[PDB]
Amino acid sequence: NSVSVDLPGSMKVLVSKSSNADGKYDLIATVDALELSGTSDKNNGSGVLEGVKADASKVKLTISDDLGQTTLEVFKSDGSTLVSKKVTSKDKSSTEEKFNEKGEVSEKIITRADGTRLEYTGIKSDGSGKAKEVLKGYVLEGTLTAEKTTLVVKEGTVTLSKNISKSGAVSVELNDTDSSAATKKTAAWNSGTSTLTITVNSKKTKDLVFTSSNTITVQQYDSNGTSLEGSAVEITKLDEIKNALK
């Protein structure tokens, strides 16, 4: 009878070959040992399935009509308040949330399609909390407010701040408390190329590029302070960001 359908979020659903007397299709899925079941208006594996955890928490799997997105939710045993929600979007990125007793989000883990992550923890009712970005090879740490995420790396008297706005726009700034003009770093941000250019003693020294691939690269200028030299090097560990700030 049934037809297996592959779903975003590493799940499968079995949809009946034919519809019932009401025209509806039966859906069955097994998600981490839990058996979920439902009925659907459509014949392609989309719709709603429900079951329960061993501890009586309610579970619902919602598959969008075009199979592009899945939502896996856990609720209190009466089904009233959310406990956890995982949404896998059509790019196969995911958001995984936990909620407090009021249904307010207390943790949000974003896994980008490329596997890098934003981890927001200890989220309060104002949308503030702790923030981490998990990149390939290293992690950046900072805070979340309702206005932006700010991830901070410190080296000497330099503080590098990577900001991710509420709308997702990246900007980077550098601030150095160094008194000496021979050694003080300053930097300018180019939003078009996502590039922070560092200057010391009125000469450009380095370009730090925050790529659309969620990597950081560093390239030096010649001693003339005007032309780039060599080729950009991808950062592989936090120590190499610190090196770029020296």
From Swiss-Prot:
Stored Gene3D superfamilies: 3.90.930.1, C1 set domains (antibody constant domain-like) (2.40.128.160)
Coiled-coil annotated residue ranges, if any: none
Pfam family, one: Lipoprotein_1
Result, substituting residue 63 to V: In strain: CA8
Reported impact of residue 117 to K: In strain: 21343WI
Keyword Membrane included in the entry's annotation: yes
Superkingdom assignment: Bacteria
Gene Ontology, cellular component aspect: cell outer membrane; cell surface; membrane
Effect caused by changing residue 122 to E: In strain: PBre and 42373NY3
Cellular compartments annotated: Cell outer membrane; Cell surface
Record membrane topology: Lipid-anchor
Family that this chain belongs to: Belongs to the OspA lipoprotein family.
Role of this protein: Induces host (human and mouse) cytokine release by monocyte cell lines via TLR2 and CD14; nonlipidated protein does not stimulate host cells.
Record-given protein name: Outer surface protein A
Source organism: Borreliella burgdorferi (strain ATCC 35210 / DSM 4680 / CIP 102532 / B31) (Borrelia burgdorferi)
Source lineage: Bacteria, Pseudomonadati, Spirochaetota, Spirochaetia, Spirochaetales
Gene name for this UniProt entry: ospA
